Amino acid sequence: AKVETHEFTAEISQLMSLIINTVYSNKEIFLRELISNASDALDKIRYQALSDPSQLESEPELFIRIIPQKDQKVLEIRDSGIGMTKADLVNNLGTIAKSGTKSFMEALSAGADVSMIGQFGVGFYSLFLVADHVQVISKHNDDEQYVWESNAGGKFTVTLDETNERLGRGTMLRLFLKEDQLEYLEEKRIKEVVKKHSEFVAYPIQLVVTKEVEK
Ligand SMILES: Nc1nc2sc(CNC3CCN(C[C@](O)(Cn4cncn4)c4ccc(F)cc4F)CC3)cc2n(-c2ccc3c(c2)N(c2ccccc2)CCO3)c1=O
Ligand SMILES: [Mg+2]
């Protein structure tokens, strides 16, 4: 029930500051990056399930689900992948993310397109193109459901999840959209971006749409 605060490594907080402030034109590549991460997490549970089919019982369906929350100015990207333990959420640091972050920043200084972020293994942080803060809700088969939270600053929190829907297994990113990036709540826009950048995905990409029942 305690909110644990942790500090990012310097290189991660440097990267998040660059991304949250960039005026880069093609911000829609965030969604490709998060879909790719979701797909990778799904691949990992599928791989475990091949030897042990009981690892799927926590959530039998393998999906990616996009949930616009228009009233909250939130976009949720959910997967039923392997998920992250509390120790996985606290271990964003001492990771390959450290190696990805410094060389990507150097590449950006040399003129690399921001869309190359995924090639450096740090495409998660592309969410700061469109969002000023994020909650990462995750449930691994070996642990309880936890919430990781960040505002692109130096600090993050990890809290035992007593407030969100149960994932069963997997991860949900809750993006708190910037006031100029509310186009990513619209069905038409999300469909366009998925179709353009995420044609080759092995799992269903489900879009959750809320419409008024009319006369
Ligand atoms: N939707 C998603 N769902 C999943 S689920 C998953 C599991 N990740 C674990 C990582 C540790 N692995 C252990 C391994 O390292 C694998 N290994 C083996 N040999 C080389 N490596 C290892 C090491 C030693 C060993 F003895 C055994 C091992 F298995 C297991 C999978 C990660 C993940 N993200 C994700 C994608 C990209 C990211 C982040 C999260 N970030 C991030 C963001 C916020 C909080 C924490 C983190 C920040 C950077 O980018 C998703 O977005
Ligand atoms: Mg296990």
Curated annotation (Swiss-Prot):
Keyword vocabulary terms for this entry: ATP-binding, Chaperone, Cytoplasm, Nucleotide-binding
Source taxon at top rank: Eukaryota
GO biological process entries: cellular response to heat; filamentous growth; filamentous growth of a population of unicellular organisms; negative regulation of filamentous growth of a population of unicellular organisms; nuclear receptor-mediated steroid hormone signaling pathway; protein folding; protein stabilization; regulation of apoptotic process
Sample GO molecular function, one term: unfolded protein binding
Main location: cytoplasm
Residues annotated as binding ATP: N37, D79, K98, F124
Localization terms from the record: Cytoplasm
GO CC terms: cell surface; cytoplasm; cytosol; extracellular vesicle; fungal-type cell wall; hyphal cell wall; membrane; mitochondrion
Entry remark concerning the domains of this protein: The TPR repeat-binding motif mediates interaction with TPR repeat-containing proteins.
Subunit structure as annotated in this protein's UniProt entry: Homodimer.
Family: Belongs to the heat shock protein 90 family.
Function field: Molecular chaperone that promotes the maturation, structural maintenance and proper regulation of specific target proteins involved for instance in cell cycle control and signal transduction. Undergoes a functional cycle that is linked to its ATPase activity. This cycle probably induces conformational changes in the client proteins, thereby causing their activation. Interacts dynamically with various co-chaperones that modulate its substrate recognition, ATPase cycle and chaperone function.
Protein name: Heat shock protein 90 homolog
Source organism: Candida albicans (strain SC5314 / ATCC MYA-2876) (Yeast)
Residues of the full protein shown: 4 to 218 of 707
